Amino acid sequence: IANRFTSNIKGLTQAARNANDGISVAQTTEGALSEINNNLQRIRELTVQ
Amino acid sequence: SAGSATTNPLAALDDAISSIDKFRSSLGAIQNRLDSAVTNLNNTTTNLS
Numbered sequence: 001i002a003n004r005f006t007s008n009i010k011g012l013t014q015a016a017r018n019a020n021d022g023i024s025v026a027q028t029t030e031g032a033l034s035e036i037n038n039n040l041q042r043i044r045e046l047t048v049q
Numbered sequence: 050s051a052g053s054a055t056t057n058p059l060a061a062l063d064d065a066i067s068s069i070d071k072f073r074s075s076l077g078a079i080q081n082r083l084d085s086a087v088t089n090l091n092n093t094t095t096n097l098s
Contacts, residue, residue: 024096031092039085 055061 028093028096031096032089035085035089035092
């Protein structure tokens, strides 16, 4: 049972690290998207003009 | 060889001014896109760090 607990603990810690990496991916993509949205807003303003 | 008075001076001056204005507009557009690139680079650098 101690061996099983050790396996579970190590697996869960590594899974937490993987989840942190996923959050990083989402942050980067969302930053790029924000820049794209700013560009689109400026394009719409120019079109209205 | 000697010449004569220009037939249509104001039209030529207008054409020169128009060319200058087109160059200025293109330069301003390039500078705006460069500033947007700077902002995107800063955001991506922060996220990757």
